[PDB]
Amino acid sequence: ARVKRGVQANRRHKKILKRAKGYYGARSRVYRVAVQAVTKAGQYAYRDRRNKKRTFRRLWIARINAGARLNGLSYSRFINGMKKANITIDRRVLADIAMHDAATFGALVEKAKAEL
Amino acid sequence: MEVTAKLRGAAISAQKVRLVADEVRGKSIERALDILTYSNKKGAVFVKKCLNSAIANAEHNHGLDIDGLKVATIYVDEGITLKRILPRAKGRADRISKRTCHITIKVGE
Amino acid sequence: RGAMQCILAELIRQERLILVEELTISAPKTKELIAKLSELNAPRALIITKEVDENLYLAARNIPHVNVLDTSEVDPVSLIAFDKVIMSVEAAKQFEEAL
Amino acid sequence: MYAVIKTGGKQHRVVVDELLKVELLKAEQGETITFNDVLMVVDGETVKIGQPVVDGASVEVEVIEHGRGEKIRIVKHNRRKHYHKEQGHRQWYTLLKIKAINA
Amino acid sequence: GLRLNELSPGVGAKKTAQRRGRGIGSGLGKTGGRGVKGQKSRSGSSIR
RNA sequence: GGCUCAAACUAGGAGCCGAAGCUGCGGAUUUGAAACUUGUUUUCAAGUGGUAGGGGAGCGUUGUGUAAGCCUGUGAAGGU
RNA sequence: UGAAAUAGAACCUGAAACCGUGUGCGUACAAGCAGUAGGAGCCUCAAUUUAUUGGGGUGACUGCGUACCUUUUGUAUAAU
Secondary structure (H helix, E strand, O other): OOOOOHHHHHHHHHHHHHHOOOOOHHHHOOHHHHHHHHHHHHHHHHHHHHHHHHHHHHHHHHHHHHHHHHOOOOHHHHHHHHHHHOOOOOHHHHHHHHHHOHHHHHHHHHHHHHHO | OOEEEEEEEEOOOHHHHHHHHHHHOOOEHHHHHHHHHOOOOHHHHHHHHHHHHHHHHHHHOOOOOHHHOEEEEEEEEEOOOEEEEEEOHHHOEEEEEEOOEEEEEEEEO | OHHHHHHHHHHHHOOOEEEEOOOOOOOOOHHHHHHHHHHHOOOOOEEEEOOOOHHHHHHHHHOOOOEEEEOOOOOHHHHHHOOOEEEEHHHHHHHHHHO | OEEEEEEOOEEEEEOOOOEEEEEOOOOOOOOEEEEOOOOEEEOOOOEEEOOOOOOOOOEEEEEEEEEEOOOEEEEEEEOOOOEEEEEEEOOEEEEEEEEEEOO | OOOOOOOOOOOOOOOOOOOOOOOOOOOOOOOOOOOOOOOOOOOOOOOO
């Protein structure tokens, strides 16, 4: 009962070469290089799934700092004033408001400054 | 509309014939024939020969006016390689690739 | 012996066993056996009885899914495989003695 | 008119008739869910901010359908240490449509 | 008495055999449980 | 980079940033405990980094029976 | 002619490496395992009462990121 590996090997290798589409050079053409690039790509995706939350929190904090300083206050005091006012708005929503609605963020800064 | 001539099996490397092909690609048949007949490369005889075959095809089998024809597209492909042995010093042997090429020419308005 | 016992019991339980008093084909001739099977409503069957006559064997062998075996030389793969079973009471008694 | 609401441990700035995506909710097809814990409702020039919630403000939403998230491939690998691991994950999500916003 | 298509050995009657050196996922890859390079990892090794 | 009543040091005080730690939301799984009770259902508790290694559960391929079956020139295998 | 001629005799199918041609986007002020998480612009299909979404192609710019195996106390290793 002999088994030939041709068909299964072909399909196994096509899966990897399909996941390796768009890569440079040997990485998208030959299996020995493509398979490493796909595994390394998965590793990068796994790590950046952690890192993306930090990056976006970073961006929200930067935008909130910019808005607070336009309204006459720093980020470390504006967040403290939020926490003393018992305002639960997250940094994502705060950055959205700062970026797309200046007057509402001004009102928020007024509440924070009244609480400070 | 595209009339084709093929010159499969030229005794010359495709890499050499491609330099000739790049200069006649897209030109009118008169200019291409002039370039090929005043070209100093061996690939030029094969390319002119295939272009003449294509022009004859377009004029005889399809009744086209060769005055308005053009080299619509041309490319050279690698043919079958003849494998030969080259003796070297100290009783060592090397393989020799005597390469061939296939020339495809399509002419049209 | 216990596997044979269970096979026979389950054949009875799912009604794939049919007892007949006797099954003797008068002459070697497939069509007569087919006519008998027509009235018995068993197009495909396995026939086991005291002894196998040459005429019944010659009639049975040609038929696609009809086979005849003696009671002593009976296999579980055959009993399980063939959809219906035709079996005589004397053969049944000898199965009781054997098992 | 917009409001800031909570769902699935996240906060969303939403407007009327917007199609939003949130974590899987155990709520049947087409039912109406009312949230009274909205953090802020903005009507334009008028702004109301809860401390931490705004009394008398409710938001009504409906669940159009429940769908699994796009497949995501997860790969762990330790170089030279004879260890690889492969997994596939889909995150359940529910679409939400805001019929109206009340301040 | 059932069909040849639907007989089973029963739970616990059959166990699948171990095959050494068939990848990482099997738990026996690269060595077949022999550890690293000693006398006991070689082909004709025994426990005298 | 640049920094001198510091962006250095000493002694304090208040904020904030900061990890895959904790919390929030959704999902999977090991063991154990309760009950329609061999996944029949719902829950609760503690867990779920891993080399050598041990234990458990499966995928795919060739062949045999199932199979004189079923599919198939209204298109099998293979390839893309 | 043949059902079929990229079944034309190197002739059933016809993969990959490798090498051409064509179309779309990007690329000549910018330094590194070449990806990944974001992301403008452009092109192309579908909707949609008409530049707004969905699928596909490319990827300006920003963050992170020194292959695999083996053997080792320990490897991007300039150890195999």
